[PDB]
Write a protein that binds this ligand. Structure first.
Ligand SMILES: CCCCCCCCCCCCCCCCCC(=O)OC[C@H](COP(=O)([O-])OCC(O)COP(=O)([O-])OC[C@@H](COC(=O)CCCCCCCCCCCCCCCCC)OC(=O)CCCCCCCCCCCCCCCCC)OC(=O)CCCCCCCCCCCCCCCCC
Ligand SMILES: CCCCCCCCCCCCCCCCCC(=O)OC[C@H](COP(=O)([O-])OCC(O)COP(=O)([O-])OC[C@@H](COC(=O)CCCCCCCCCCCCCCCCC)OC(=O)CCCCCCCCCCCCCCCCC)OC(=O)CCCCCCCCCCCCCCCCC
Ligand SMILES: CCCCCCCCCCCCCCCCCC(=O)OC[C@H](COP(=O)([O-])OCC[N+](C)(C)C)OC(=O)CCCCCCCCCCCCCCCCC
Lengths: 54, 206, 41, 231, 365, 67, 67
């Protein structure tokens, strides 16, 4: 009886906000500022060497 | 058959009774235990064998010893039909019992959902190690939802740290040695002002 | 309680040593003490 | 693991763990009619009905963008109640708050509804994003079922049902297949399955202490110049 | 018999981490009054294996100190508790020292035991004279291959069910699942049959231990947390030249990072000359490794342990004067100058040697 | 019990007779701190532990007392 | 992920030299030595070990070979 199980068609999509995006989020937080800050200073400049540069 | 066949039945009833705390439940356990002991009572009396030839020879009324034997043997043939009963008890039973069959089944599904929550959390927690080794915006992604709440504090101008947290533990750690040791009041907004003022017969509102 | 509180507070060594002598094996008092304790255990 | 060792961590000048009426010099004092000429106060007795109307608006104004998704309306209701039950179940004695907690929470909820009326509240946007990510995965399953194909979730359910038979077919000495055993069977399958996927590195450190990032390429140097595109 | 005295008791599962008692073997010294040494064996490793090391006339360690071969919680005969917090396990030792009337002791350890020993000096330094660590370092070893194997073996041991499994089923399980000979032998001897042959079990708590290792987080024994702090006293480290646990390249820096008085290689840190062999961790088995460890141990106990920091050796006691910081004494009419720091008797609290000698001093005058 | 038993014991917590005459460090280490050493965080932990033993881990006495 | 390789190469530089591809020229650590670190002597010992493993502890080969 369980093997006879079927599925219902779900909704196609929810509401899509026309003024909110991932790169231009509508609301503000230090999280997005941190994302842009690290894009600016770039990744941790890892030295592959055996000794420091100085 | 006689020995060891009731050991398991005693462990079940014992646990069911131990879980009983209210007097009402304890009473039902007594009724339940009686029926089990009633059904599981063992009968051993050494059913004696009848030697009709012995009684037939020593003394008996003509036709009596034989009439008793033939009639006695006829009833001995009759026996219980265990098959028919075995089916009815297994097919359906006590539609009232179906009430708790579906109650305990939903009750278990509730606490199986919680068991899966705690189980899956400890599963995902395996890949998360050393919070001090992750960047800020990456930790918030592991704890999805904090950035959303942080935006709520910002957009409502609740920029007093720990105002909406019931236990602002971070606020107690910073005030361990502060003058006028105090933490922000619950849900305090930096814009609300409940100040009052009154004029009395005396000066300064006194 | 009082009596309970009060209760709360060589030859075998030679036998084993001679055996170790016959096999001319190095022997130490610690080993002998353990074997002696092993016999009593 | 680690517990706060300072026994006076939750001490305040007002008492233990007091975040409802902090001690301040200008403390509340009573007023006497016979001696009071005039007064300027903003307190009132309108918070109860404002608490009611605020719930009705936040619910009815957020449902405008659910598109009749009944499961979302019910999930949102449970989440909306969690926001209004904060003063009823908190450790904070919301009834002893300095100048009236009732007026305080109501005014705080009104600021939330203001954003909800414009459809700019983060909980709204969080809801739309979370739901779209959910429906996309339910539609992916529906398209695979209509094609007669088996879903990744069913392949595990079927693979787990047989693994249980194999374990209890050999577990004859005992017959108590605990939930703990059932659990570690699935986890052994989840770890194996998750490791099979090409997922981004989540843990800082791999089997070695070294970090699993693209930056953890140290000596020795064995990579040549980068090559260009092929035509 | 006399030299070897191990108190006998039964492990007790404890809900409170403070009601934990430690049990182990005591080795009496040759001489009447000697300071005491508390030594922690490797995890899941037997205390008896170290007896021939501490009872060897060639080394003659007992001539210096009385030795307590002590088992940590969840190990051996000591009480059982799921937590392995080094602060909690360190308080356990302080209660043992109190119950046994030990004012202060010399601490030692092998491998993970060395961490436990050093942790006690970090949390209770005023009552620890020195630390002697063997093939260990105050470092996170969770990702060392040697630790993973130990972490892996303990997990395999959780599969065995003594009730159903037979004696032969166990022996076959160990040989195949445990490749290292020594670990295999260690685990076999840890198996014991309780009274009335009810069933066989491991002397150490396999459940509490596996969770600590398998979880692989800060509370793990392989981990060394910043919470443990710094050890202020004398510390000497000895490890093999080629050791899987302590690599000479970088695993020596944690010693300087955690131990303030460690001078460096050749003074407080030594390596034993040896070949590459995974069994070199067990120095007590190989005479070459042991002879060097013993000599360095006797030197630490004789000249360096329980000596004030600013003094070089025990030779300087009574002839080297330490500078004094100004405004450090309560007396106002005190002419500040150099002084020789006070070194006290090893068990001055639980004896009256000071009260006795004060009387004898008066008789002279 | 054994934990509290030894805490109360005068012998277990007793300064030696000459302890008063000895030179006493009158700081926990918060006056001059090492800021750039790799064991920096480990140093702070020993300051916190020293401040706690002085107050039986009731740091309110430190907040009220004189620094 | 999908755009990981393309993005990671866009953010940072890799070392293009293949200096270590040549075996014998690999350094044992005697070219740039740390002189003041507290593990100074442990570093020299590892340099000595690498020089010995390369010659089966017959350092006459190193003296005759090219540095
Ligand atoms: C016509 C021809 C003219 C052009 C010729 C072309 C060539 C010109 C030269 C260009 C050179 C480019 C390549 C070298 C640049 C970096 C050199 C360097 O030492 O950095 C390595 C060093 C670490 O390298 P590492 O060995 O791999 O160690 C990594 C650890 O993470 C490090 O952290 P750690 O804590 O773990 O380890 C210790 C750390 C210790 O170091 C540190 O952690 C911090 C060092 C202090 C940073 C400076 C703070 C100054 C505050 C701002 C004030 C000045 C701003 C400048 C502008 C002011 C207005 C004019 O680093 C060290 O190992 C030793 C430090 C070596 C000295 C550091 C100070 C160098 C001077 C930097 C400031 C220069 C401007 C002021 C000079 C006077 C201006 C006239 O990084 C830095 O020092 C960063 C500071 C900024 C460096 C770039 C600044 C501009 C270029 C500076 C050239 C220096 C010489 C000239 C000035 C010296 C005058 C006394
Ligand atoms: C027999 C003596 C010949 C001396 C010739 C005159 C001076 C050198 C001219 C050539 C320049 C290159 C020098 C390479 C050898 C380095 C020797 C050295 O510096 O001593 C290191 C040595 C210890 O340091 P080391 O690291 O163990 O030495 C190993 C090397 O570092 C590295 O170890 P390795 O095993 O890998 O290398 C072995 C060594 C083996 O060397 C030999 O076996 C010598 C071969 C016979 C001699 C060939 C050179 C003859 C020059 C005469 C013709 C000169 C014409 C000039 C004008 C007219 C002159 C009248 O070097 C070579 O293999 C040479 C191969 C050249 C490869 C060429 C590849 C193509 C490159 C093309 C571009 C070239 C641009 C170069 C830039 C300009 C150069 C500055 O010190 C001593 O031996 C002490 C005892 C004195 C040795 C006898 C004197 C020999 C000259 C050394 C200076 C003595 C100063 C004494 C005072 C000390 C301070 C108070
Ligand atoms: C650094 C660059 C930027 C700097 C920006 C300025 C940052 C200032 C940092 C915060 C300073 C906060 C000072 C608050 C002092 C309160 C102390 C206290 O609670 O009293 C407890 C005290 C002491 O109790 P206690 O328990 O808290 O401390 C005890 C102290 N010992 C340990 C010594 C015993 O008791 C009182 O209640 C007396 C209250 C007197 C309050 C007098 C201060 C009034 C000044 C604040 C008003 C200023 C408003 C300015 C607005 C200007 C607008 C234009």
């Amino acid at each position: 009886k369980e093997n006879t199980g079927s599925m219902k068609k779900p909704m196609a999509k929810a509401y899509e906000h026309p003024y909110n995006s991932e790169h231009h989020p509508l609301n503000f937080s230090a999280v997005k500022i941190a994302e842009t800050f690290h894009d600016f200073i770039g990744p941790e400049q890892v030295s592959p060497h055996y000794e420091s540069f100085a | 058959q006689a020995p060891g066949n009731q050991d398991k039945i005693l462990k079940w009833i014992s646990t069911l009774s131990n879980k009983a705390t209210t007097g009402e439940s304890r009473s039902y356990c007594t009724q339940l235990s009686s029926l089990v002991s009633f059904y599981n009572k063992q009968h051993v009396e050494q059913i004696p064998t009848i030697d009709f030839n012995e009684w037939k020879s020593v003394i008996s009324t003509q036709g009596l010893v034989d009439k008793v034997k033939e009639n006695y043997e006829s009833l001995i043939k009759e026996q219980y039909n265990t098959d028919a009963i075995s089916k009815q008890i297994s097919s359906a039973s006590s539609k009232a019992l179906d009430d708790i069959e579906n109650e305990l089944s939903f009750h278990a599904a509730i606490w199986l959902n919680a068991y899966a929550d705690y189980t899956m959390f400890l599963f995902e927690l395996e890949e998360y190690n050393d919070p001090n080794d992750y960047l800020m915006h990456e930790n918030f992604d592991f704890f999805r939802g904090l950035e959303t709440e942080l935006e709520e504090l910002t957009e409502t101008h609740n920029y007093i740290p720990g105002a909406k947290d019931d236990v602002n533990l971070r606020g107690y750690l910073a005030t361990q040695f502060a003058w006028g040791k105090k933490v922000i009041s619950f849900y305090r907004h930096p814009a609300d002002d409940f100040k009052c003022a009154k004029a009395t017969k005396n000066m300064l509102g006194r | 309680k009082r009596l309970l509180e009060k209760l709360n507070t060589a030859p075998q060594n030679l036998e084993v040593e001679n055996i170790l002598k016959r096999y001319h094996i190095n022997y130490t008092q610690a080993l002998i003490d353990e074997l002696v304790d092993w016999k009593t255990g | 693991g680690y517990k706060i060792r300072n026994k006076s961590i939750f001490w305040t000048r007002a008492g233990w763990k007091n975040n409802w009426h902090p001690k301040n010099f200008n403390a509340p004092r009573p007023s006497y009619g016979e001696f009071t000429m005039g007064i300027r106060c903003r307190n009132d007795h309108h918070s109860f009905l404002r608490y009611v109307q605020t719930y009705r608006n936040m619910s009815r104004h957020c449902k405008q963008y659910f598109l009749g998704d009944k499961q979302l309306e019910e999930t949102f209701i449970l989440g909306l109640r969690s926001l209004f039950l904060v003063p009823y179940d908190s450790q904070c004695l919301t009834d002893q708050i300095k100048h009236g907690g009732e007026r305080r929470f109501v005014d705080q909820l009104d600021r939330d509804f203001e954003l909800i009326s414009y459809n700019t509240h983060p909980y709204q946007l969080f809801t739309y994003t979370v739901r779209n990510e959910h429906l996309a995965w339910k539609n992916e399953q529906y398209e695979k079922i209509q094609k007669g194909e088996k879903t990744f979730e069913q392949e595990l359910l079927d693979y787990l049902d047989e693994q249980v038979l194999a374990e209890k077919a050999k577990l004859r000495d005992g017959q108590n297949f605990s939930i703990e055993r059932m659990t570690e069977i699935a986890l052994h399958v989840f770890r194996k399955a998750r490791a099979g996927k090409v997922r981004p590195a989540q843990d800082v450190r791999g089997p070695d202490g070294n970090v699993n990032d693209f930056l953890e390429q140290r000596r020795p140097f064995e990579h040549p110049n980068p090559t260009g595109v092929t035509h | 018999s006399r030299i070897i005295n191990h108190l006998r008791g039964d492990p007790v599962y404890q809900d409170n981490t403070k009601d934990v008692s430690l049990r182990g073997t005591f080795l009496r010294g040759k001489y009447d009054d000697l300071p005491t040494m508390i030594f922690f064996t490797e995890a899941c490793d037997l205390t008896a294996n170290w007896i021939p090391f501490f009872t060897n006339p060639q080394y003659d360690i007992l001539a210096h100190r009385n030795v307590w071969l002590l088992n940590p919680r969840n190990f051996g005969n000591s009480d059982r508790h799921p937590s392995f917090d080094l602060q909690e396990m360190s308080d356990d030792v302080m209660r043992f020292m109190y119950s046994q009337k030990i004012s202060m002791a010399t601490l030692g350890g092998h491998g993970i035991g060395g961490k436990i020993a050093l942790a006690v000096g970090c949390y209770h330094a005023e009552r620890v004279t020195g630390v002697f660590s063997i093939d260990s370092s105050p470092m996170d070893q969770r990702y060392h291959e040697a630790f993973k194997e130990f972490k892996g073996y303990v997990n395999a041991l959780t599969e065995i069910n003594f009730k159903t499994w037979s004696d032969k089923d166990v022996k076959v399980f160990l040989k195949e699942n445990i490749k290292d000979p020594k670990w295999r032998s260690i685990f076999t001897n840890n198996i014991s049959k309780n009274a009335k042959t009810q069933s066989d079990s491991f002397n150490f708590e396999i459940n509490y231990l596996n969770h600590n290792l398998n979880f692989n987080k800060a509370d793990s024994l392989g981990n060394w947390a910043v919470k443990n702090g710094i050890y202020t006293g004398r510390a000497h480290f000895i490890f093999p030249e080629y050791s899987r646990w302590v690599h000479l390249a970088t695993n020596t820096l944690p010693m300087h990072k955690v131990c303030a008085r460690v001078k460096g290689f050749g003074h407080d840190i030594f390596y034993v000359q040896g070949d590459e062999n995974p069994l070199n961790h067990w120095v007590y088995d190989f005479e070459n490794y042991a002879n060097v460890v013993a000599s360095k141990l006797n030197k630490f106990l004789h000249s360096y342990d329980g000596v004030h920091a600013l003094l070089k050796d025990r030779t300087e006691i009574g002839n080297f004067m330490i500078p004094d910081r100004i405004k450090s004494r309560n007396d106002s009419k005190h002419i500040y100058g150099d002084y020789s720091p006070a070194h006290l008797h090893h068990n001055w609290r639980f004896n009256h040697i000071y009260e006795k000698h004060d009387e004898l001093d008066k008789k002279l005058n | 019990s054994l934990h509290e038993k030894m805490q109360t014991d005068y012998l277990w917590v007793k300064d030696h007779s000459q302890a008063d005459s000895w030179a006493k460090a009158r700081t926990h280490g918060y006056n001059y701190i090492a800021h750039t050493v790799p064991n920096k965080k480990e140093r702070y932990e020993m300051i916190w532990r020293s401040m706690g033993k002085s107050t039986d881990w009731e740091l309110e006495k430190f907040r009220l007392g004189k620094k």
